[PDB]
Amino acid sequence: HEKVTIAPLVLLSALDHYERTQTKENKRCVGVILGDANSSTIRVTNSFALPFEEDEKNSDVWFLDHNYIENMNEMCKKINAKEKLIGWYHSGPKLRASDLKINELFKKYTQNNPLLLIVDVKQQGVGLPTDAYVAIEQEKTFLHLPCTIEAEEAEEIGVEHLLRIRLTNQLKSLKGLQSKLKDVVEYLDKVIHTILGKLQDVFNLNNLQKALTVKTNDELMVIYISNLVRSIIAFDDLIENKIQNKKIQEQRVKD
């Protein structure tokens, strides 16, 4: 599959618009992304904002500015001519049912499949909660793609200036287990379709991990053997330094 990369310039741009647009009472701020989707790795080097207002009790009322789309063409094209509109982004933690109708408005300006980017403004997740989706023909479905961080001279300089293993993964595995656990509890309470089909894929593919235990410990002892021959070398860098430090002490006594 393809890849999606979001620069920290786009990250901080979407996260700052929360307090800039006075977004509260669980609302969203619809932006726009600028990148090159022609390659296999989608990289967004520019982003902007758009005014968005939606009623809480009415999902059929939403405001969008299509005039600002033509305003960035008179600006960005005079600086970077390789910037095009590959889609938009949202500041909400989870998508709603209105995103299906938003794709009809941007399909004329975008020259390719629009990209759906979701950025969590609450920062309540672990790692990179920012996710991306690609709308294709199912009627329509959203194909998720992994999100990475852009590494370039135009970003890491500003990141290092403002700012300056398994234990982290343990908290990440709990998020995947509790997500499926709470989904079953909410399902049984509201009743007594794609999740039920893919749910048993994990159960039939951790009692099954105990059959290879005989072959698992075969390569585990090699790790300790590699550490045993390395442990002897560890003393070679120590005792040798003790001999050198002893010769330094003999010169300090004569002083």
Partner: protein
């Protein structure tokens, strides 16, 4: 596209059901009767005027009685050579998928010849043949061992529309969440 518009009357719905009743019975692709109970197909027609054999097909395929298929399909239908070959293909797939969930406990999906032969009333020569054909179509993965008299079958079919394992797999997620949380607390201490 027939339900929203374009002659939504029951006149075209009863005529369309004649095509699905013949195709779903002979079709070996997705289950046998599984797709009939999900989509409201039989609910749009009546129970009389040669529509009765479609409703009785559910109990005939579920029980597995061979004598029911003789009286269910007369000579005006079974005379086609297609159903003559598919006459034995209906009871082989359902009884094969039934033995998978029956023997399954934790890690053991293994079957044998006596469980398959007594269920389908077929000789051991057809156990390594008719079942092998379903494996090659993508329904199953594991194979059958003729020497040691052991049948090792993997899990492929997602088994849609179950509902019994939903309450059983709920405790599986709790068991997985407790083992990770127990090992996760030891990582913070040391």
């Amino acid at each position: 596209t027939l339900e929203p518009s374009t002659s939504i009357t029951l006149a075209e719905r009863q005529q369309l059901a004649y095509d699905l009743s013949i195709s779903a019975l002979l079709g070996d692709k997705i289950y046998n009767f599984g797709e009939l109970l999900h989509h409201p197909i039989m609910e749009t027609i009546v129970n009389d005027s040669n529509y009765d054999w479609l409703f009785q097909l559910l109990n005939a395929l579920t029980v597995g009685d061979f004598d029911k298929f003789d009286s269910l399909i007369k000579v005006q239908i079974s005379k086609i050579p297609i159903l003559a070959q598919h006459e034995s293909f209906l009871r082989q797939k359902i009884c094969l998928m039934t033995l998978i969930e029956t023997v399954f406990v934790k890690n053991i999906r293994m079957l044998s010849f006596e469980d398959i032969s007594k269920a389908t009333h077929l000789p051991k020569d057809n156990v390594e043949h008719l079942v092998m054909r379903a494996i090659s179509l993508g329904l199953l993965k594991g194979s059958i061992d003729q020497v040691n008299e052991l049948v090792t079958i993997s899990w492929v079919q997602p088994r849609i529309i179950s509902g019994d394992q939903i309450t059983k797999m709920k405790d599986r997620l709790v068991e997985w969440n407790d083992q990770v949380e127990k090992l996760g607390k030891k990582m913070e201490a040391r």
